[PDB]
Amino acid sequence: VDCSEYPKPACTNEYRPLCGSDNKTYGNKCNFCNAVVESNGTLTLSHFGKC
Amino acid sequence: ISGGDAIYSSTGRCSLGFNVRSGSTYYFLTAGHCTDGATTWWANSARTTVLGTTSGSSFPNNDYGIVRYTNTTIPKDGTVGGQDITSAANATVGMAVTRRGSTTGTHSGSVTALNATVNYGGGDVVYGMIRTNVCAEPGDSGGPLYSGTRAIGLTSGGSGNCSSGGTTFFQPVTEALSAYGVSVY
């Protein structure tokens, strides 16, 4: 996952979860990457799938 | 199985929008972004109960797809959770609506704007969307937006979430019904 083209003003709502370094499961890549931007690049990917 | 229930494709989970039919052929509508590149749909994460196979998929530009039922025994209720749906209708500004989806369950709100353009990025832009103040979260895609016994839209995408509040766009259901020649029941 590359969050370079983010942030995006909207995300689709399909579910294909990723596990963030904050131990939160993100519902999809778009949700994930917008959180990464929102944390000012502090949040990273732990692994794919639910945490 | 009914509107709002979970559906699984090879890639992830979405929500069933509405059970529709044409003559004796049953199908269900869901989001186009969910049907894009999916062939078979199942009713469970284990993929043991088959639902059917995709028959049409329209995304981007629009955001609707239809799946033809191949499972003969699964009940195909013309409802949303227990709510009966009897007809389809055009969204209007100020209309009170409700959404049901497989991750968040049922949430209400109102139509805030019509014919909105949502740019999901990479050339995925959808047009003609209904804007509302209803929240939705991953997994809720393709679930129904209804008002009373009237079908109105299919969940597409948005921002925010159900804890803090958000904005969700829906694809008008009438357009989908018309493209495929099917009707709610």
CSV table of C-alpha atoms in Angstrom, one decimal:
chain,number,residue,atom,x,y,z
A,1,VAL,CA,0.0,0.0,0.0
A,2,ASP,CA,1.2,3.5,-1.1
A,3,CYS,CA,-0.7,6.4,0.4
A,4,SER,CA,0.8,8.9,-1.8
A,5,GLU,CA,-2.2,10.0,-3.7
A,6,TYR,CA,-3.9,10.8,-0.5
A,7,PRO,CA,-5.8,12.3,1.1
A,8,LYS,CA,-9.0,11.7,-0.7
A,9,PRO,CA,-12.2,13.4,0.2
A,10,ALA,CA,-14.3,10.2,0.0
A,11,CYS,CA,-13.7,6.5,0.3
A,12,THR,CA,-15.9,3.6,-1.1
A,13,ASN,CA,-17.2,1.3,1.8
A,14,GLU,CA,-16.2,-2.2,0.7
A,15,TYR,CA,-14.5,-4.3,3.4
A,16,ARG,CA,-10.9,-5.6,2.9
A,17,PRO,CA,-9.2,-4.8,6.2
A,18,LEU,CA,-5.6,-3.7,7.1
A,19,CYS,CA,-4.0,-3.6,10.5
A,20,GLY,CA,-2.5,-0.3,11.5
A,21,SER,CA,0.4,0.3,13.9
A,22,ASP,CA,-2.1,1.7,16.3
A,23,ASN,CA,-3.6,-1.7,16.5
A,24,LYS,CA,-6.8,-0.5,14.8
A,25,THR,CA,-8.2,-2.5,12.0
A,26,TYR,CA,-8.9,-0.1,9.0
A,27,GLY,CA,-11.9,-1.2,6.8
A,28,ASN,CA,-10.0,-0.6,3.6
A,29,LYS,CA,-7.0,0.9,2.1
A,30,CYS,CA,-8.7,4.3,1.4
A,31,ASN,CA,-9.7,4.5,5.1
A,32,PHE,CA,-6.2,3.5,6.1
A,33,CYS,CA,-4.4,5.9,3.9
A,34,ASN,CA,-6.6,8.9,5.0
A,35,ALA,CA,-5.7,8.0,8.6
A,36,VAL,CA,-2.0,8.0,7.7
A,37,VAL,CA,-2.4,11.5,6.3
A,38,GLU,CA,-4.3,12.5,9.2
A,39,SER,CA,-1.6,11.4,11.6
A,40,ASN,CA,0.9,13.3,9.6
A,41,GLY,CA,2.6,10.1,8.5
A,42,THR,CA,3.0,8.8,11.9
A,43,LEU,CA,0.7,5.7,11.4
A,44,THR,CA,2.1,2.7,9.5
A,45,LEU,CA,0.9,-0.7,8.3
A,46,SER,CA,1.5,-3.7,10.7
A,47,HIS,CA,0.0,-6.2,8.4
A,48,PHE,CA,-2.8,-7.1,6.0
A,49,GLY,CA,-6.1,-8.3,7.5
A,50,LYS,CA,-7.7,-7.6,10.8
A,51,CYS,CA,-5.6,-6.8,13.8
B,1,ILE,CA,-31.3,-13.0,2.9
B,2,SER,CA,-32.4,-9.4,2.7
B,3,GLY,CA,-31.3,-5.9,2.1
B,4,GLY,CA,-28.5,-4.8,4.4
B,5,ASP,CA,-27.1,-8.4,4.8
B,6,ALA,CA,-23.4,-9.3,4.3
B,7,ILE,CA,-22.3,-10.6,0.9
B,8,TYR,CA,-18.8,-11.9,0.2
B,9,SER,CA,-16.9,-11.9,-3.0
B,10,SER,CA,-13.5,-13.2,-3.7
B,11,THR,CA,-12.0,-10.1,-2.6
B,12,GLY,CA,-14.0,-8.7,0.4
B,13,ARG,CA,-17.4,-8.0,2.0
B,14,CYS,CA,-20.2,-5.8,0.9
B,15,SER,CA,-23.8,-5.5,1.7
B,16,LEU,CA,-26.8,-6.7,-0.4
B,17,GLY,CA,-28.8,-3.7,-1.5
B,18,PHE,CA,-32.2,-4.9,-2.7
B,19,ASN,CA,-33.8,-8.2,-3.9
B,20,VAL,CA,-35.2,-7.5,-7.4
B,21,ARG,CA,-36.6,-9.6,-10.1
B,22,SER,CA,-37.5,-9.8,-13.7
B,23,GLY,CA,-40.2,-12.3,-14.6
B,24,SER,CA,-39.2,-15.5,-12.8
B,25,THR,CA,-35.5,-14.5,-12.5
B,26,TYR,CA,-34.3,-13.3,-9.2
B,27,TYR,CA,-31.3,-11.0,-8.7
B,28,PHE,CA,-30.0,-8.6,-6.1
B,29,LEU,CA,-28.5,-5.1,-6.5
B,30,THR,CA,-25.4,-4.0,-4.8
B,31,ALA,CA,-22.6,-1.4,-5.4
B,32,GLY,CA,-20.9,-1.4,-8.8
B,33,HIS,CA,-17.5,-1.1,-7.0
B,34,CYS,CA,-18.3,-4.4,-5.3
B,35,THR,CA,-19.3,-6.2,-8.5
B,36,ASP,CA,-16.4,-4.9,-10.4
B,37,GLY,CA,-14.2,-7.9,-11.1
B,38,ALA,CA,-16.1,-10.3,-8.9
B,39,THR,CA,-17.7,-13.3,-10.3
B,40,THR,CA,-19.4,-15.4,-7.6
B,41,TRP,CA,-21.0,-14.2,-4.4
B,42,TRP,CA,-21.4,-16.1,-1.2
B,43,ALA,CA,-23.6,-15.5,1.9
B,44,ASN,CA,-20.8,-16.3,4.4
B,45,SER,CA,-17.2,-15.6,5.1
B,46,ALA,CA,-16.5,-19.3,4.8
B,47,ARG,CA,-17.8,-19.2,1.2
B,48,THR,CA,-19.9,-22.2,1.8
B,49,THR,CA,-23.3,-20.8,0.8
B,50,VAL,CA,-23.4,-19.6,-2.8
B,51,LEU,CA,-25.6,-16.8,-3.7
B,52,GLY,CA,-25.0,-16.3,-7.4
B,53,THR,CA,-22.9,-14.7,-10.1
B,54,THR,CA,-22.5,-11.2,-11.3
B,55,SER,CA,-24.6,-10.2,-14.3
B,56,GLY,CA,-23.8,-6.5,-14.6
B,57,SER,CA,-21.5,-4.1,-13.1
B,58,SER,CA,-21.4,-0.3,-13.7
B,59,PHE,CA,-18.6,1.6,-11.9
B,60,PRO,CA,-17.1,4.2,-12.2
B,61,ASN,CA,-19.5,6.9,-13.6
B,62,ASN,CA,-22.4,5.1,-12.0
B,63,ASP,CA,-22.2,2.8,-8.9
B,64,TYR,CA,-24.5,-0.2,-9.3
B,65,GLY,CA,-24.1,-3.9,-10.2
B,66,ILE,CA,-26.5,-6.9,-10.2
B,67,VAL,CA,-26.0,-10.4,-9.3
B,68,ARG,CA,-28.1,-13.3,-10.5
B,69,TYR,CA,-29.2,-15.8,-7.9
B,70,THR,CA,-28.1,-19.4,-8.6
B,71,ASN,CA,-28.9,-20.6,-5.1
B,72,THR,CA,-32.3,-22.2,-5.2
B,73,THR,CA,-33.2,-22.6,-1.7
B,74,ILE,CA,-32.0,-19.5,0.1
B,75,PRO,CA,-35.0,-17.3,0.9
B,76,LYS,CA,-35.0,-14.0,-1.1
B,77,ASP,CA,-37.0,-11.6,1.0
B,78,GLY,CA,-38.2,-8.3,-0.6
B,79,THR,CA,-37.3,-6.4,2.5
B,80,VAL,CA,-34.6,-4.6,4.3
B,81,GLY,CA,-34.0,-6.5,7.5
B,82,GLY,CA,-37.5,-6.9,8.6
B,83,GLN,CA,-38.8,-3.8,6.7
B,84,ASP,CA,-41.0,-4.3,3.7
B,85,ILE,CA,-40.2,-2.5,0.5
B,86,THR,CA,-42.9,-1.9,-1.9
B,87,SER,CA,-41.8,0.5,-4.5
B,88,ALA,CA,-38.9,2.7,-5.6
B,89,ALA,CA,-38.8,6.5,-5.5
B,90,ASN,CA,-36.7,9.5,-6.4
B,91,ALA,CA,-34.7,11.1,-3.6
B,92,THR,CA,-35.6,14.7,-2.8
B,93,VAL,CA,-33.7,17.3,-0.7
B,94,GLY,CA,-35.0,17.1,3.0
B,95,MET,CA,-36.2,13.5,2.7
B,96,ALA,CA,-35.8,11.4,5.7
B,97,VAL,CA,-34.1,8.2,4.9
B,98,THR,CA,-32.5,5.1,6.5
B,99,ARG,CA,-29.6,3.0,5.6
B,100,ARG,CA,-28.8,-0.6,6.7
B,101,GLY,CA,-25.4,-2.2,6.0
B,102,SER,CA,-23.5,-5.2,7.2
B,103,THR,CA,-21.0,-3.5,9.4
B,104,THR,CA,-23.0,-0.6,11.1
B,105,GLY,CA,-26.5,-1.9,11.0
B,106,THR,CA,-29.2,0.7,10.7
B,107,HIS,CA,-28.7,4.5,10.7
B,108,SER,CA,-31.1,7.4,9.7
B,109,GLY,CA,-30.6,10.9,8.4
B,110,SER,CA,-31.8,13.0,5.5
B,111,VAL,CA,-31.0,13.8,1.9
B,112,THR,CA,-28.9,17.0,1.9
B,113,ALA,CA,-28.2,17.3,-1.9
B,114,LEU,CA,-28.8,15.6,-5.3
B,115,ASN,CA,-26.7,15.1,-8.5
B,116,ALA,CA,-23.4,15.3,-6.6
B,117,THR,CA,-20.1,14.3,-8.1
B,118,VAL,CA,-17.8,12.2,-5.9
B,119,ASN,CA,-14.2,11.7,-7.0
B,120,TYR,CA,-12.8,8.5,-5.4
B,121,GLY,CA,-9.5,9.0,-7.2
B,122,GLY,CA,-7.5,7.4,-9.9
B,123,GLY,CA,-10.2,8.2,-12.4
B,124,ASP,CA,-12.9,6.6,-10.3
B,125,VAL,CA,-15.4,9.5,-10.4
B,126,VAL,CA,-19.1,8.8,-10.0
B,127,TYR,CA,-21.8,11.4,-11.0
B,128,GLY,CA,-25.5,11.9,-10.1
B,129,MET,CA,-25.2,10.9,-6.5
B,130,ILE,CA,-27.5,11.6,-3.6
B,131,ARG,CA,-25.7,13.3,-0.7
B,132,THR,CA,-26.9,12.7,2.9
B,133,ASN,CA,-25.9,13.1,6.5
B,134,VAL,CA,-26.1,9.4,7.2
B,135,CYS,CA,-22.9,7.7,8.3
B,136,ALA,CA,-21.5,4.4,6.7
B,137,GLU,CA,-18.4,2.4,7.3
B,138,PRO,CA,-16.4,-0.3,5.4
B,139,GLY,CA,-18.6,-3.2,4.7
B,140,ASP,CA,-21.7,-1.1,4.3
B,141,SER,CA,-21.1,-0.6,0.5
B,142,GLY,CA,-24.1,-1.5,-1.7
B,143,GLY,CA,-26.6,-1.6,1.3
B,144,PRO,CA,-30.0,0.0,0.9
B,145,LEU,CA,-31.1,3.5,1.5
B,146,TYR,CA,-34.8,3.6,1.9
B,147,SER,CA,-37.6,5.7,3.3
B,148,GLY,CA,-40.5,3.9,4.8
B,149,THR,CA,-41.5,1.2,2.2
B,150,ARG,CA,-39.7,3.0,-0.6
B,151,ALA,CA,-36.4,2.0,-2.0
B,152,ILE,CA,-34.2,5.0,-2.8
B,153,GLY,CA,-30.5,4.3,-3.2
B,154,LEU,CA,-27.4,2.1,-2.8
B,155,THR,CA,-24.6,2.9,-0.5
B,156,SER,CA,-21.6,4.1,-2.4
B,157,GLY,CA,-19.0,5.9,-0.3
B,158,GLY,CA,-18.3,8.9,1.9
B,159,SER,CA,-16.4,10.3,4.8
B,160,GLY,CA,-16.4,10.3,8.5
B,161,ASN,CA,-18.0,7.5,10.5
B,162,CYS,CA,-20.8,6.6,12.7
B,163,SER,CA,-19.1,7.6,16.0
B,164,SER,CA,-18.2,11.1,15.0
B,165,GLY,CA,-20.9,11.6,12.3
B,166,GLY,CA,-20.3,11.6,8.5
B,167,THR,CA,-21.5,12.1,4.9
B,168,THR,CA,-22.6,9.2,2.6
B,169,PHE,CA,-23.4,9.3,-1.1
B,170,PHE,CA,-25.8,6.8,-2.6
B,171,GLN,CA,-26.5,5.8,-6.1
B,172,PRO,CA,-30.2,6.4,-7.1
B,173,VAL,CA,-31.8,3.1,-7.2
B,174,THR,CA,-34.3,4.0,-10.0
B,175,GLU,CA,-31.5,4.2,-12.4
B,176,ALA,CA,-30.3,0.8,-11.7
B,177,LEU,CA,-33.8,-0.7,-11.9
B,178,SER,CA,-34.2,0.8,-15.3
B,179,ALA,CA,-30.9,-0.3,-16.7
B,180,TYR,CA,-31.5,-3.9,-15.9
B,181,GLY,CA,-35.2,-4.0,-16.5
B,182,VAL,CA,-35.9,-5.3,-13.0
B,183,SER,CA,-38.2,-4.3,-10.3
B,184,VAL,CA,-38.4,-4.4,-6.4
B,185,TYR,CA,-41.0,-6.8,-5.0
